[PDB]
Write a protein that binds this DNA or RNA. Structure first.
Lengths: 199, 203, 102, 147, 58
RNA sequence: CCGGACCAAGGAGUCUAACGCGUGCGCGAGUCAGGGGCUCGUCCGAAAGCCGCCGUGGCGCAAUGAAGGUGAAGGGCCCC
RNA sequence: UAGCGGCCCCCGGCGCGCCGGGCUCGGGUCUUCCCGGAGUCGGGUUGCUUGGGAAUGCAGCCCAAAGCGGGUGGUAAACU
RNA sequence: UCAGUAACGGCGAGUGAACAGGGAAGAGCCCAGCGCCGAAUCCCCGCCGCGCGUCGCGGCGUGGGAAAUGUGGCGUACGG
């Protein structure tokens, strides 16, 4: 079978694959059907943004991705409470809610709170009965300036030169990283030997 | 409430009280038929936390199940083929003894809907279960919105499709790293997805 | 500066201020309320003990704590479960001795 | 295109380029990588040394995301900022130095292959190499650690 | 059972024949612990006749 | 030695995946939208066009060690 | 055939108005209380299954719980 | 996409996922239990006022039955 130089290939064609072959000739058809579903949904919810509710700002959970920010599932109960929005009225307003999300820090809490306040100020609330309005919005902003948003609501998107001082110039970046890795490694056994020496 | 006391009471199955009760009940069920209609649940507290309610349309059936493993039904124990498939005697059924109790109640009572089941007794040769059934065409059931789901045609013979609580346990579904064989809804669904060659138009 | 945030070491990680909040109600599961302790104590008085619990208490009476632990571990299965069962049976024997002295 | 292939020019030749003596049979050798130790143990030794055997220790549940540490050398360090930044910084007479935030460009560790212009610079990164830090200092810059 | 737990009951009457005895096998001991008097009566339909039903337990 | 009595029509290195080398083209330390989305009901058009505020990602741009880890500047001319 | 071409019959939904029936109650702050699914979990063993490797999942038999507990944290175990 | 990767395998032939990341879609909820409320609850049968495309409403019933071995309302871990 092998002939001179080559690669040791291991193809996974030992399992009657011809009975399970997924062809994508219906791919253009499912793009039109998905598109017409979007357009019909946008008309059915016409004044509403047609891009779903407003999602919060979320940090990606890994070293590879913790420098980036994306959209989360919903605003947590802690940021909804600080903003002063009831958790059972947020869904009706157009606010996604994630009851199972925690808030480890305060900057991420405050960023999502300010995002909620910006949405509330930017929101137009139509009265339940058009003839009889109550605690809603005025006629000027309702029947004259109401438009359906096109894309996602509030899209989520991702240092001056100075004189180097003598203190940071004499900073051992490589040396500190080496001692730091040693200190973490040796932390437990150093304490145990200190305790044994005490005894 | 009295239901909490009964719940803790049934947890002390080794007690002198519960050993006596389980002995006399198991004896009594052994004199009956394998499929028997019960006037009322033996464990009212266990039934209600499994979905039962004291209303017209809810019935209880007691099922007796032979206990043991699965012997391979091959003549003279001769499985023709390779040695790895020679096992006849220490083979096990994929579904539980409780699942086959629900399946046998549903097959006999075709017009009813299996809701759930629970343990009542146990012997060296038999295991006893009690199955809750709902008559989906009783007016007390299909006028109550909280129980109109069982009347829908998609809930026929849940016990034969592994949709009851006992049946689901054998399917190996869940969340996380222990359950990746069913990460698409079922074992067959996952197998098909990772055994299908995707040939796009632009390759 | 002489100090910097670092990805390695004991105090590793991007610096952030911790938000303190009341623990979620899901973490409360499995606590001993007063009423649940009462119902549990009532059932213990009505029912009694399992045969293996009596055998372990016989061992604890003659102060074979090591043998009793290895007997309970073979009954319940896990060392951490066996340890608390021995502590519970020890408390029953202790309260029985205090009442008997009274 | 089937009209540009060898089969078109093999019409009329009784053996289809596969010989009269040895013929074209189903699988004269094995199938796949069969016999890599028995009758193909010259091809495997000549062209794939190390193929058979076990080396090293296993690691269950490897998640490559935590071992993620992209690297950048010093010879590409000034490409992470605009050209105007380097020219203005060099022309400035005081000791002010521009800052290149390497993490903002998607690199975590700075390695020290190459050489730097004689132009002080502040470099921010998660990890530094020993020669990278020495070359940044020699030019007159600083290494700032970021978590 | 709730009334005994609240000491709001002055007398508890328990039928002697409950088909699942677990419904009541705890109740006499609970009544003693909280100091309410309890009696066991000879009949489960007799208590039901009091409450205009077929069967009553307590 | 075996096949071939004669005539007509049919009749056998194909397709998919994976590699390797060679060659044509585009761009070039980058390159590639292929999955998705935006544009009038869409004969052609299930095509074509565009995304750049979709480049996530793939391959390449760094290797070595089993791993913890570490990680690629050379010269010329003067002084000691 | 093209045409936001015409005419006729029928079946609809979403909005706006009329009558009849049902319901007609919320939100913060403080104080006092309440708070959970057992022959199930888990353990041993056997058989099948999985990429899951001192046991990923499933089941048979034996043992068989707890409540500041229980499950998980991809190498068996004790302590934290 | 991760990925023919971590891992499995007479460690041979061969087999082989998941998390993160980008998209399509996007929606959440209900009991049992603990409690409070004179069983407040449900099925059937009649009569009347109705309404009536082939069946719902209100009342009455000195009309039956189910249900205290527990129906209904409030309330389910995001606490109540």
């Amino acid at each position: 079978a092998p002939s001179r130089n080559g690669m040791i290939l291991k193809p996974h064609f030992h399992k009657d694959w011809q009975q399970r072959v997924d062809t994508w000739f219906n791919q253009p058809a499912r793009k039109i059907r998905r598109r017409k579903a979007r357009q019909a949904k946008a008309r059915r919810i016409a004044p509403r943004p047609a891009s779903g509710p407003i999602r919060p700002i979320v940090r990606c959970p890994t070293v590879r991705y913790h420098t980036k920010v994306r959209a989360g599932r919903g605003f947590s109960l802690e940021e909804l409470r600080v903003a002063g929005i009831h958790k059972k009225v947020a869904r009706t307003i157009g606010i996604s809610v994630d009851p199972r999300r925690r808030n480890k820090s305060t900057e991420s809490l405050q960023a999502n709170v300010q995002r909620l306040k910006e949405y509330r100020s930017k929101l137009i609330l139509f009265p339940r009965k058009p003839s009889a309005p109550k605690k809603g919005d005025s006629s000027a902003e309702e029947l004259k300036l109401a438009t359906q948003l096109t894309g996602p609501v509030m899209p989520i998107r991702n240092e001056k030169a100075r004189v180097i001082t003598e203190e940071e110039k004499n900073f051992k970046a490589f040396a500190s990283l080496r001692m730091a890795r040693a200190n973490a490694r040796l932390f437990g056994i150093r304490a145990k030997r200190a305790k044994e020496a005490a005894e | 409430g009295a239901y909490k006391y009964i719940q803790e009471l049934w947890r002390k199955k080794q007690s002198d009280v519960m050993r006596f009760l389980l002995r006399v009940r198991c004896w009594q069920y052994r004199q009956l038929s394998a499929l028997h209609r019960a006037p009322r649940p033996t464990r009212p507290d266990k039934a209600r936390r499994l979905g039962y309610k004291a209303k017209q349309g809810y019935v209880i059936y007691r099922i007796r199940v032979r206990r043991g493993g699965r012997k391979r039904p091959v003549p003279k124990g001769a499985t023709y083929g390779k040695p790895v498939h020679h096992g006849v005697n220490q083979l096990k059924f994929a579904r539980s003894l409780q699942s086959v109790a629900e399946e046998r109640a549903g097959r006999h009572c075709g017009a009813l809907r299996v809701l759930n089941s629970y343990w009542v007794g146990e012997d060296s040769t038999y295991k006893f279960f009690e199955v809750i059934l709902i008559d989906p065409f009783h007016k007390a059931i299909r006028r109550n919105p909280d129980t109109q789901w069982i009347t829908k045609p998609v809930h026929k013979h849940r016990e034969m499709r592994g949709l009851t609580s006992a049946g689901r346990k054998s399917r190996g579904l869940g969340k996380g790293h222990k359950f990746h064989h069913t990460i698409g809804g079922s074992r067959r669904a996952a197998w098909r997805r990772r055994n299908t060659l995707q040939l796009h138009r632009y390759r | 500066a002489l100090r910097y945030p670092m990805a390695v070491g004991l105090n590793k990680g991007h610096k952030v201020t911790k938000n303190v909040s009341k623990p979620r109600h899901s973490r409360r599961r499995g606590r001993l309320t007063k009423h649940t302790k009462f119902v549990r104590d009532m059932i213990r008085e009505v029912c009694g003990f399992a045969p293996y619990e009596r055998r372990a208490m016989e061992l604890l009476k003659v102060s074979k704590d090591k043998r009793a632990l290895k007997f309970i571990k073979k009954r319940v299965g896990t060392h951490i479960r066996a340890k608390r069962k021995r502590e519970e049976l020890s408390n029953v024997l202790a309260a029985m001795r205090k009442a008997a002295a009274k | 295109p089937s009209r540009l292939r060898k089969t078109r020019k093999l019409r009329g030749h009784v053996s289809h380029g596969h010989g009269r003596i040895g013929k074209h049979r189903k699988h004269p050798g094995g199938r796949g990588n069969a016999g890599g130790m028995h009758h193909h143990r010259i091809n495997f030794d000549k062209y794939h040394p190390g193929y058979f055997g076990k080396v090293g220790m296993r690691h269950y549940h490897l998640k490559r995301n935590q071992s993620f540490c992209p690297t950048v050398n010093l010879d590409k360090l000034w490409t992470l900022v605009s050209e105007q930044t380097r020219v203005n910084a060099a022309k400035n007479k005081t000791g002010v130095a521009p800052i290149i935030d390497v993490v903002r460009s998607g690199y975590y560790k700075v390695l020290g292959k190459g050489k730097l212009p004689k132009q002080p610079v502040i470099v921010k990164a998660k990890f530094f190499s020993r020669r990278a830090e020495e070359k940044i200092k020699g030019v007159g810059g600083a290494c700032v650690l970021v978590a | 059972t709730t009334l005994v737990e609240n000491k709001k009951a002055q007398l508890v009457v328990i039928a002697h024949d409950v088909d699942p005895i677990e419904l009541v096998v705890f109740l006499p001991a609970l009544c003693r612990k909280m100091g309410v008097p309890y009696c066991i009566i000879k009949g489960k339909a007799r208590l039901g006749h009091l409450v205009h039903r077929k069967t009553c337990t307590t």
